[PDB]
Amino acid sequence: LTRFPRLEFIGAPTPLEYLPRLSDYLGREIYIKRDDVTPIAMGGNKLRKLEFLVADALREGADTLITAGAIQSNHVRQTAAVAAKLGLHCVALLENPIGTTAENYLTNGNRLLLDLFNTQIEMCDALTDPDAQLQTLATRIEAQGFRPYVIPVGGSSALGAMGYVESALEIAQQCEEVVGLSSVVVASGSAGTHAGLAVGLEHLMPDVELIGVTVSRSVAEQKPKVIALQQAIAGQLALTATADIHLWDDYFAPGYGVPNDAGMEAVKLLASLEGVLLDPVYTGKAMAGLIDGISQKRFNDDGPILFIHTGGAPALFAYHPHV
Amino acid sequence: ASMPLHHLTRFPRLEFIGAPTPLEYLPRLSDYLGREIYIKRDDVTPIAMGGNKLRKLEFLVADALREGADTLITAGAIQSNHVRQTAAVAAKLGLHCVALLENPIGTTAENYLTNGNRLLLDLFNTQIEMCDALTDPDAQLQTLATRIEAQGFRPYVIPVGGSSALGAMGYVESALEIAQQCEEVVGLSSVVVASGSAGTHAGLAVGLEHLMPDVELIGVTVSRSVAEQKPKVIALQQAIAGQLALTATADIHLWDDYFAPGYGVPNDAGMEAVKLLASLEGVLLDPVYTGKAMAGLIDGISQKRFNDDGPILFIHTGGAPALFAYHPHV
């Protein structure tokens, strides 16, 4: 487990809850891991990552955090908050990945908060090669008088994903004597969350089937990225990881950041039926998957399914009327 | 010996909140303002983005269920935090939710009209009815209740902001957490909270008169003047104390200077507070309630308004979502 300094951003373990109404409607035991409920600026999965990341950034004596992502990036929002909380500067590199002109995407939702957090924001046409474009930026800042720290896209680095390894610890304990868990669903993006789970859950709950719903890439393009982190995480944790990574690509429809009916139906469903807010870019699509999953008997057995609510809610106000 | 409350447990409460919300020190802000400042994070709540209104609903909806109601009715501004939370609890529990909304600032700005809280209401499948003003809420709600009643349904009415004698029990019980958290940990001197539909302020004033009698409790009005507000708070204090089998003699304190043009209109002073807390501590306040309250807390220190120099606890009552509603302006 430990030798990696983590910061305390989350406090108590996030609640795990049963979703009786949804369960009864779908005809399956469904549980929810509430990682959206977090003290820091509306919270999210990204924070568990930043707990290790920023801890490290401080060891480096950095006075600035740099990172990149979509305009409505949950990661940037959380990063920028943590920054402000701690007194670090935050430079953010953003791309408009869907090529929209809609006011609310451009200024509202997450993006709006970044301004409140006094984030230094730079635009670019695309993040064709992030790690390089970030390093380009870092060094320019390194020059301007700032001692940075670079956080990868989505905070998905070997170290970052440590958050979700530790997450599995909570998850298994919470389920001890309390639930006979069969499957776990989580959105698979920048990969670190999925990966961290896969390492932790191989070692803590080896019988549990772990499904990732791709939000951007196909199984083809995604699987390698996940496996890479799995191995690296396992490497640094001094463990071995032999678990197969599972992924379903059918649910991200037009592509990253574009909303599908299938996913949007899942948002309306969970809000109306359970009073929980998903989001149109990540959790909604993941949930749409979970739903169609039961529909097509895709999971290993009939038993309990745990959905990892990774947050993202604020995006709702950004996506508001459309496009 | 958190005891004089004891009698304070004949009211069935639902469990929406779980663990006690975190109380935190605000080191950067403190150091900046030159005062020990603590924050009670009642915005951190599992239910649909959370808020103070939920601690109220914990008693209110519990009661609604005892009545066997299958519908909750309530009213407020378009961007009402209370309606959002009410409608959520509704959907979670499987009750219908009818909401009576007014546009209280007379704006035409898209984002106020459709975004922020109002947006979520649609996701929660809230039955929504518009009116020109809530000139007399209790009556306009009952008018609505009985029309629903006679379509063959079972409706429970929740006052504006959930501020009834019962509702405010949530914040009586909140006082318990607060004092328990500060035990040996902080020598608390003042508490600041927004004072609106009154229940939250009131509940605190009873609980804190009995649990921390030395603590000065300040309410920053967000809609009315000291003149018009004080009676409404005193009424709830007494009704609450009545039903809790206690006596309440504590003076209620109120500062009206900070709501500027009126309820739901943002002032510079208040927004300055939003930017300050976001940038300096990474906490999000809101432009209708918490911001203004905070603006008050700040100007308070500025004018030596509090009794002494000591620690101030700020009650973060939530409201954040309103930010995306108020977005570019008006």
Author numbering:
A (entry chain B): 6 to 328
B (entry chain A): -1 to 328
What does the paper say about this structure?
Structures of two distinct crystal forms of recombinant StDCyD were determined by the molecular replacement method. In the form I structure, there are two dimers (AB and CD) and in form II structure, there are four dimers (AB, CD, EF and GH) in the asymmetric unit that are similar to the dimeric organization found in other fold type II PLP-dependent enzymes. Electron density map of unliganded StDCyD revealed a significant patch of density with tetrahedral geometry at the active site that could be interpreted as a sulphate (in form I crystal structure) or a phosphate (in form II crystal structure). Form I crystals were obtained in a condition which had sulphate while conditions for obtaining form II had phosphate ions. These ions could be refined to reasonable B factors that were close to those of the surrounding atoms. Therefore, Form II structure has been utilized only for qualitative analysis.
D-cysteine (D-Cys) moieties are found in firefly luciferin, semisynthetic cephalosporin MT141 and malformin A. D-cysteine desulfhydrase (DCyD) is suggested to take part in the catabolic degradation of D-Cys and D-Cys-containing toxic compounds. The polypeptide fold of StDCyD is similar to those of other fold type II PLP-dependent enzymes and consists of a small domain (residues 48–161) and a large domain (residues 1–47 and 162–328). As in other PLP-dependent fold type II enzymes, the active site is situated in a large crevice between the two domains. StDCyD is specific for D-Cys and βCDA, and shows no activity with ACC, although it shares significant sequence identity with ACCDs.
